Design a protein around this ligand. Structure first.
Ligand SMILES: Cc1cc2nc3c(=O)[nH]c(=O)nc-3n(C[C@H](O)[C@H](O)[C@H](O)COP(=O)(O)OP(=O)(O)OC[C@H]3O[C@@H](n4cnc5c(N)ncnc54)[C@H](O)[C@@H]3O)c2cc1C
Ligand SMILES: NC(=O)c1ccc[n+]([C@@H]2O[C@H](COP(=O)([O-])OP(=O)(O)OC[C@H]3O[C@@H](n4cnc5c(N)ncnc54)[C@H](O)[C@@H]3O)[C@@H](O)[C@H]2O)c1
Length: 963
């Protein structure tokens, strides 16, 4: 039972509506352009004099270049400090994210200390004048909420500042801002009791709804603001109601609204309750002058928002302002009546306290304080593990796994779903081991735990899709070996294990030696889930006889490998006929054309280059700029110098250390330049061991130079300067790799050309090229980035590789065929393959498929034609079956003999009854090609995969939220 509830608003309702009607009684870029003023020009001082004379005070707010680095952050602060030295200026307002760039959401304690350390000179400037001018802390995003309130309350209780009247914004569209108001109102009572001065809250409804909904939909969270504007109008009245009392004399209030009903309410409440000296009204300078003057005569104090800017930042600042001003009379009086009634009934908990039902597992939310609380208490688990060195133990363990009988699809599905539940329960144990043993930050390790959970649920669904009624039958492998790397030490090992189980096989997990405790901690979830030693076996083999015995073992049906392409050739050399599916790094670029948003491009380039210190198969190693990209390079430099280098287990780290000191390749990338190149930012070695390296940026990296064609797997980004988009696309395509790639451009024709011409498995448009989410962006590369037939992990065809398919007897439905195909189909078998190709093409291969259907991001799964297929053997009928497939995809068939050469990463189809000659297998193992040696299937749903390259195209759909 809450003593703040009352009926004053109900009683004043009609004098309020009369008041609003009374005040209302007495293209766009042109307007905002004439309202932004030079922070140093005379125009501003004239407007301060003229408005002071008319009885107004001005809220001076400094706009400018996006605050991506400490350089520009110092600019906003020092330049705001200069305005507070101007005696005509009464009121400045600034945001935490303008004072600290790249505000790390996981380090609230450190962010607070940094903000206080940086803002004290500014508040001192307000103490050196009497009367003291006013500093307001603005709020835009939900992540600003607790750090800013904490900044406000700690700073204003320091002895130095105890008597300074200062202010802070609450956004009423956040339900939990009602709780923030109550805590701030108590804080003001605690402060007054200590002899301190009042605080002031500026009440706003909220200007960031668009990006707040995007932030939610991307992560699988509820939006932080209310779902409807009625709730916002209601909470605006509730917060006003609560705070405009004599009980809270120490909290002055700025009502910031052009809604005359909202303002008339605060006016009438202040008069009825005798708290007129706590009510200022804050409005937009120049927007509604006739209204604001009516308001002034009633309320007294009216404070006009006045945007100012540094000269160069003018056109930049006008665009920021255009979005804010765009996105934000009897049916007006009725919507107000309703908000008066809902005032006390609207929610007050934070929408982020729980999560909507989504398919993808949702990440940890550092906007919740309960999240930041367990992030402080993470542990350093040290599970025991054993090294396998005896080949006879590999043999004993392998045969023991084969003896367990196959589980049926229901049992596998139940185990996988349980495995995903249990992984979630140890998310914090996984974070503990990943941030110590693997050296990852929380921001990098936490989505990886989500990926590991998603693999279990996704591949569970896929396993059911194997028995879908159709024209072929799947038979799983008995045993798959998963050889995993260290950079993603939970999701990649588990993803291969889950895929094997879903297919019907037993799995051996052999984890990379740097991250053996990661595998052990993850294994405890599988065990809790019911996945015992008869199903999955963890084998820490060496890389000598026992490891080789495991990878070459006659009873291992496939290896899933993530690592160096030299490792894939090594393994296959030991058994060239082996099934191997390998993801093997990439040399990935982001193209930035003059039509790009330079700031969004910089944020995506630097985050893609430097997450996990660049230790990603998908990392952005190259940025290729077309022509002149303006502020891009300066901002990229500022953002890169601002990354905090340190160990992953330190909350303040925003770029972690390396897994071990650089090898030859990476040390070269860090220390030495090639001809004509220069360091825009030169990497520095920051500790004796050589694991902590600051990031670097090479300029003038030329096509075919060493850094263009060698993945260093470290914190090094190279800039190439291209004369045209067409040339930049040539350069992006000639790295030897084809894993990830992105373009930044707001020009639709450039994007369409890029979507068609770029040769990468994972394409991204106007966003980062890392962070692939299961089913949203199925992950896998072309060219040297992949070994095998190559279905994408986290895509619908991956499980189906872990076995073999055969044609079955079935009745084909009636579907029409174009006559060119029927000319080729001169057999029972060939007619059956012609028809099934048509159906598969209609069902799957000819469709661009967005499985997740997000509003803010288009995520497309499509098939691209394989250009050339090599054919080994002689069999006219089967060769005609391949001509049918090639006529439909456009692929070129090339007949291939023994000892005839073929390029690296080729696909070679085996036809006929003869074995494939061994030399072809041996050569394929050296240059990473794949000999497809199963029977030729009539069912194109299976056979056509040999003629297609899977591809994910992910495109941002919104322009700062608008879609
Ligand atoms: C002087 C001044 C200072 C300001 N300072 C800030 C600041 O520091 N931080 C900040 O975030 N904004 C700030 N604002 C903007 C404020 O938050 C509003 O966006 C704006 O003033 C318009 O709202 P309203 O009360 O005029 O009119 P209205 O038409 O009454 O209110 C519009 C508001 O309703 C809300 N809304 C509309 N549709 C929906 C929906 N479908 N679901 C949920 N909510 C919805 C939005 O918050 C929207 O802004 C400031 C505004 C002024 C005038
Ligand atoms: C890429 O990947 C590079 C190499 O990193 P990496 O050494 O961890 O990957 P890697 O390609 O050498 O090996 C990855 C996995 O295969 C295993 N493996 C490699 N050789 C083996 C052998 N002879 N016997 C048994 N198992 C073996 C590894 O231990 C690990 O589990 C990075 O530097 C980057 O350039």
């Amino acid at each position: 039972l809450m003593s703040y509830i009352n009926r004053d608003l109900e009683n004043l309702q009609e004098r309020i509506i009369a008041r609003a009607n009374e005040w209302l009684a007495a293209r766009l870029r042109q307007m905002v352009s004439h309202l932004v003023l030079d922070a140093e020009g005379k125009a501003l001082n004239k407007l301060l004099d003229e408005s002071k004379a008319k009885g107004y005070r001005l809220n001076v707010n400094l706009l400018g270049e996006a605050v991506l680095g400490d350089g520009e952050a110092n600019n906003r602060l020092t330049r705001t400090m200069e305005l507070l030295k101007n005696p005509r200026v009464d009121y400045v307002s600034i945001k935490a994210t303008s004072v600290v760039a790249q505000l790390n959401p996981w380090d609230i304690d450190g962010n607070t200390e940094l903000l206080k350390e940086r803002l004290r000179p500014l508040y001192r400037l307000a103490l050196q004048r009497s009367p003291h001018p006013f500093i307001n802390l603005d709020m835009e995003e939900y992540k600003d909420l607790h750090v800013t309130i904490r900044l406000f309350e700690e700073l204003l209780m320091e002895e130095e500042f105890l008597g300074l009247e200062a202010g802070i914004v609450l956004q009423a569209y956040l339900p939990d801002s009602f709780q923030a108001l109550q805590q701030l109102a108590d804080f003001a009572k605690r402060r007054a009791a200590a002899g301190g001065a009042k605080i002031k809250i500026r009440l706003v409804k909220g200007a960031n709804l668009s990006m707040e909904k995007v932030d939610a939909e991307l992560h699988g969270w509820y939006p932080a603001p209310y779902a409807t504007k009625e709730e916002v109008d209601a909470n605006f009245l509730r917060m006003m109601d609560y705070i405009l009392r004599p009980e809270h004399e120490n909290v002055r209030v700025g009502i910031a609204s052009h809604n005359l009903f909202s303002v008339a309410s605060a006016y009438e409440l202040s008069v009825e309750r005798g708290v007129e000296t706590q009510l200022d009204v804050e409005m937009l300078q120049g927007m509604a002058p006739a209204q604001a003057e009516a308001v002034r005569q009633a309320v007294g104090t009216v404070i006009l928002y006045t945007p100012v800017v540094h000269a160069e930042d003018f056109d930049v600042a006008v665009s920021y302002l255009v979005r804010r001003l765009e996105e934000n009379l009897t049916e007006q009086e009725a919507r107000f009546r309703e908000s008066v009634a809902q005032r006390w009934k609207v929610a007050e908990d934070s929408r982020r306290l729980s999560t909507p039902e989504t398919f993808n597992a949702s990440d940890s939310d550092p906007a919740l304080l309960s999240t930041l609380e367990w992030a402080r208490t993470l542990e350093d688990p040290q599970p025991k593990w054993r090294l396998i060195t005896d080949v006879e133990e590999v043999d004993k363990t392998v045969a023991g796994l084969l003896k367990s009988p196959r589980l049926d699809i229901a049992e596998r599905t139940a185990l996988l779903q349980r495995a995903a539940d249990e992984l979630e329960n140890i998310r914090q144990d996984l974070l503990g081991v990943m941030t110590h043993e693997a050296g990852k930050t929380i921001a990098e390790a936490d989505p990886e735990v989500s990926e590991a959970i998603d693999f279990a649920r996704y591949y569970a669904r896929c396993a059911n899709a194997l028995n879908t009624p159709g024209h072929s039958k799947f038979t799983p492998h008995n045993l798959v070996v998963v050889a995993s790397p260290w950079n993603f030490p939970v999701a990649i090992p588990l993803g291969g294990v889950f895929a094997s189980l879903a297919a019907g096989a037993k799995a051996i997990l052999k984890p990379a030696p740097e991250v053996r405790r990661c595998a052990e901690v993850a294994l405890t979830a599988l065990r809790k889930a019911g996945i015992g030693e008869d199903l999955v076996q963890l084998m820490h083999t060496d890389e000598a006889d026992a490891g080789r015995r495991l990878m070459s073992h006659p009873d291992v049906d496939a290896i899933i490998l993530t690592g160096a392409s030299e490792t894939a050739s090594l393994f296959r050399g030991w058994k060239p006929e082996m099934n191997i599916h390998a993801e093997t790094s990439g040399k990935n670029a982001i193209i930035v054309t003059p039509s790009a948003d330079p700031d969004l491009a910089v944020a995506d380039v630097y985050k893609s280059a430097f997450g996990h210190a660049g230790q990603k198969c998908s990392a952005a190693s190259l940025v290729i700029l077309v022509g002149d990209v303006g502020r891009f390079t300066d901002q990229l430099i500022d953002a890169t110098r601002t990354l905090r280098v340190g160990y992953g287990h330190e909350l303040s780290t925003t770029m972690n250390g390396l897994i071990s000191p650089p090898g030859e390749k990476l040390h070269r990338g860090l220390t030495t330049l090639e001809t004509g190149e220069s360091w825009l930012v030169k990497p520095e070695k920051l500790n004796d061991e050589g694991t902590l390296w600051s990031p670097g940026i090479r300029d003038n990296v030329r096509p075919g130079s060493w850094f263009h064609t060698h993945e260093c797997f470290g914190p090094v980004l190279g800039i190439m300067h291209a004369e045209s988009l067409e040339q930049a696309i040539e350069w992006q395509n000639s790295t030897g790799f084809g894993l990830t790639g992105g373009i930044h451009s707001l020009d639709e024709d450039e994007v369409e050309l890029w979507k068609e011409k770029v040769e990468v498995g994972n394409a991204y448009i106007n966003r980062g090229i890392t962070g692939a989410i299961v089913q949203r962006q199925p992950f896998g590369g072309w060219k040297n980035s992949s070994v095998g037939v190559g279905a994408k992990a986290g895509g619908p065809n991956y499980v189906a590789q872990l076995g073999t398919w055969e044609d079955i007897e079935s009745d084909v439905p009636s579907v029409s065929l174009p006559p060119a195909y029927r000319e080729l189909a001169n057999t029972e078998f060939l007619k059956r393959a012609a028809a099934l190709d048509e159906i598969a093409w209609r069902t799957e291969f000819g469709v661009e498929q967005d499985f997740t259907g997000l509003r803010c991001e288009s995520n497309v799964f499509r098939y691209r034609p394989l250009e050339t297929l090599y054919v080994v053997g002689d069999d006219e009928e089967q060769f005609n079956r391949l001509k049918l497939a090639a006529l439909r995809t456009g692929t070129e068939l090339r007949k291939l003999e023994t000892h005839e050469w073929f390029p690296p990463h080729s696909r070679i189809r085996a036809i006929g009854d003869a074995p494939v000659p061994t030399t072809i297998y041996e050569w394929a193992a050296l240059n990473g090609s794949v000999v497809i040696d199963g029977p030729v299937l009539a069912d194109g749903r299976r056979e056509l995969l040999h003629f297609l390259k899977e591809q994910a195209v992910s495109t941002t759909n919104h322009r700062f939220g608008y879609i």
